[PDB]
RNA sequence: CUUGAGUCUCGUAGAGGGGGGUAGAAUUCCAGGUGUAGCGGUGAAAUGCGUAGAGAUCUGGAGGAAUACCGGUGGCGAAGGCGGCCCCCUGGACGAAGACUGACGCUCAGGUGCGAAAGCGUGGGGAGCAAACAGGAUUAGAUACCCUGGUAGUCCACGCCGUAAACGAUGUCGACUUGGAGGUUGUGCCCUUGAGGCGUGGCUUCCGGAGCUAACGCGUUAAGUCGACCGCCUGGGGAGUAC
């Protein structure tokens, strides 16, 4: 019609722009295997821009010791 | 100016000190005419992996606005200092920082992730301040 | 590129009171202030070749707009060169 | 190999085990199967295999 | 792997290929060769070829329908 | 005069460049604990390492290169080229609207400039790999393949000849000429209500039509229709050599 403008949330797996980055830990861990490493864009369905941006946020997090760098001994 | 998302964490046994470190830096930033967008302390946390023989550390998020010289001046202190275990500074020129989008990230932590525990009160208590009341 | 608040100052002084953007004197003054800023950068950064390419684009470009200006108003061109300190 | 080894530790009165698995060879899972059939209880079959994060250059073997 | 987080007792149905994060089948690409630095242009940029194989199958259903292959 | 070309504010994506720091996994080495006879290697083997306690295994330190997964037909780049993370300096492109100058354009002999690579000088560095070199094997030889070691080198800093299958084997810029299916990034409109519908620019990739090409094949990113300017070719060998 005219200016109601996107109430719904269901689309792409990334309809909101994920504007919390490396601080929402539970959002990150959805994209991390049990062996502690990032999964690919084809499996998660994240749009490619967001996916490159999520990878950066995961690496940021790993160096901050929020996320397992690897599962080694953990 | 420029906006800096500073995260740093401090080794447990000197952590009991830490509002005194924050009180030193925040006056060092605002005395250089910066502004503190926010100080959220994240508390004591259990590391993802040990960092040089240590299993837990206490995490502090400062969001500074400041000129380039000032962040540089903080890093030289952080470098020569036993107390900091590891430190990170992110970004530079986003005005998105000013409107404080981690006001929510602090609240989201409080509602579910961060809860009552003994270690994060131990870290708070050094700076205990009674300089308010009218005379 | 040059600082936004400095840029406001450059346009103000080498443009007319209409505050042009495109006028030839103003473009040459903007390039010049950027060449002088960059000339401080390539003191320390001797081996930066990919940014040096952009330098040679600014210098070449200025050189062309100077040709243009001298084909038009020779009074304005002789004035501009000395007010911005160009050559010897 | 596993059953022979199982004899050597009988002198230590061991009954329960955890096992670390290490490398790309064959025998990798088949050795575990021999340990459980030795009468040992196995707690985790933790594969540990050591993986460079890109790291040092491999030899280039089988060459042309 | 057999997997160490499934639940800890020996249950022998678990097929190790149908239980691998990554191990073997790419992971030891880094042993007994260095994949010569842009050898991958001819090893790995046969992505077009395997995307073609999927296109070919997706075509081949349709040509069999109009030709009546049975 | 303003469509060309240039210019301003607001924004966006990216391994574009340079300088500094920093983190984990791993090969190695030294140190120490446990522990016993092979370990390592291949087609099989031997040289090697091992009963002076190896290999494996636990701890701690040292060092140097690379920087898993993410990574994709992906992306950026004048090209060669560039993938951890963090900051500092900085280049270029693209958009959306407004405005501004007014042909400032295109091409380029000579010319100056910019290198993958190995090579190269002087200084540092040396963990892995590894020409030369050695030893073992196969062979009728076997200066080779394969295996055990290993030097220069690769790595940094600064300087030198500028080579390449330096490529799309396709010179630049510009106009024009049916589409489909996909990547990717800005962006106008939608109860934005089906990882959905309509609108517009940027690059990018597989397919194919008219046409062209000897043919393969190209095909709106041309090898189609043309414009401008530059390079270059004139049978094979000899020769990209001699002087």
UniProtKB/Swiss-Prot annotation, chain A:
<dbReference type="InterPro" id="IPR018275">
    <property type="entry name" value="Ribosomal_bS18_CS"/>
</dbReference>
<comment type="subunit">
    <text>Part of the 30S ribosomal subunit. Forms a tight heterodimer with protein bS6.</text>
</comment>
<keyword id="KW-0687">Ribonucleoprotein</keyword>
<dbReference type="GO" id="GO:0005737">
    <property type="term" value="C:cytoplasm"/>
</dbReference>
<dbReference type="GO" id="GO:0003735">
    <property type="term" value="F:structural constituent of ribosome"/>
</dbReference>
<dbReference type="Pfam" id="PF01084">
    <property type="entry name" value="Ribosomal_S18"/>
</dbReference>
<comment type="similarity">
    <text>Belongs to the bacterial ribosomal protein bS18 family.</text>
</comment>
<comment type="function">
    <text>Binds as a heterodimer with protein bS6 to the central domain of the 16S rRNA, where it helps stabilize the platform of the 30S subunit.</text>
</comment>
<keyword id="KW-0689">Ribosomal protein</keyword>
<dbReference type="GO" id="GO:0002181">
    <property type="term" value="P:cytoplasmic translation"/>
</dbReference>
<dbReference type="InterPro" id="IPR036870">
    <property type="entry name" value="Ribosomal_bS18_sf"/>
</dbReference>
<dbReference type="GO" id="GO:0005829">
    <property type="term" value="C:cytosol"/>
</dbReference>
UniProtKB/Swiss-Prot annotation, chain B:
<comment type="similarity">
    <text>Belongs to the bacterial ribosomal protein bS6 family.</text>
</comment>
<protein>
    <recommendedName>
        <fullName>Small ribosomal subunit protein bS6</fullName>
    </recommendedName>
</protein>
<feature type="modified residue" description="N6-acetyllysine">
    <location>
        <position position="93"/>
    </location>
</feature>
<dbReference type="InterPro" id="IPR035980">
    <property type="entry name" value="Ribosomal_bS6_sf"/>
</dbReference>
<dbReference type="GO" id="GO:0002181">
    <property type="term" value="P:cytoplasmic translation"/>
</dbReference>
<dbReference type="InterPro" id="IPR020814">
    <property type="entry name" value="Ribosomal_S6_plastid/chlpt"/>
</dbReference>
<dbReference type="GO" id="GO:0070181">
    <property type="term" value="F:small ribosomal subunit rRNA binding"/>
</dbReference>
<dbReference type="InterPro" id="IPR000529">
    <property type="entry name" value="Ribosomal_bS6"/>
</dbReference>
<dbReference type="GO" id="GO:0048027">
    <property type="term" value="F:mRNA 5'-UTR binding"/>
</dbReference>
<keyword id="KW-0007">Acetylation</keyword>
<keyword id="KW-0699">rRNA-binding</keyword>
<comment type="subunit">
    <text>Part of the 30S ribosomal subunit. Interacts weakly with uL2 in one of the 3.5 A resolved structures.</text>
</comment>
UniProtKB/Swiss-Prot annotation, chain D:
<protein>
    <recommendedName>
        <fullName>Small ribosomal subunit protein uS11</fullName>
    </recommendedName>
</protein>
<comment type="subunit">
    <text>Part of the 30S ribosomal subunit. Interacts with proteins uS7 and bS18. Cross-links to IF-3. In stalled ribosomes contacts ribosome rescue factor SmrB.</text>
</comment>
<comment type="similarity">
    <text>Belongs to the universal ribosomal protein uS11 family.</text>
</comment>
<comment type="function">
    <text>Located on the platform of the 30S subunit, it bridges several disparate RNA helices of the 16S rRNA. Forms part of the Shine-Dalgarno cleft in the 70S ribosome.</text>
</comment>
Swiss-Prot record, chain E:
<comment type="function">
    <text>Probbly involved in recognition of ribosome rescue factor SmrB in stalled/collided disomes; fusion of protein fragments to its N-terminus decreases ribosome rescue in the presence of SmrB.</text>
</comment>
<feature type="compositionally biased region" description="Basic and acidic residues">
    <location>
        <begin position="59"/>
        <end position="70"/>
    </location>
</feature>
<comment type="subunit">
    <text>Part of the 30S ribosomal subunit. In stalled ribosomes contacts ribosome rescue factor SmrB.</text>
</comment>
<comment type="similarity">
    <text>Belongs to the bacterial ribosomal protein bS21 family.</text>
</comment>
<dbReference type="GO" id="GO:0005737">
    <property type="term" value="C:cytoplasm"/>
</dbReference>
<keyword id="KW-0687">Ribonucleoprotein</keyword>
<dbReference type="GO" id="GO:0019843">
    <property type="term" value="F:rRNA binding"/>
</dbReference>
<dbReference type="InterPro" id="IPR018278">
    <property type="entry name" value="Ribosomal_bS21_CS"/>
</dbReference>
<feature type="compositionally biased region" description="Basic residues">
    <location>
        <begin position="45"/>
        <end position="58"/>
    </location>
</feature>
<keyword id="KW-0689">Ribosomal protein</keyword>
<keyword id="KW-0699">rRNA-binding</keyword>
<dbReference type="GO" id="GO:0005829">
    <property type="term" value="C:cytosol"/>
</dbReference>
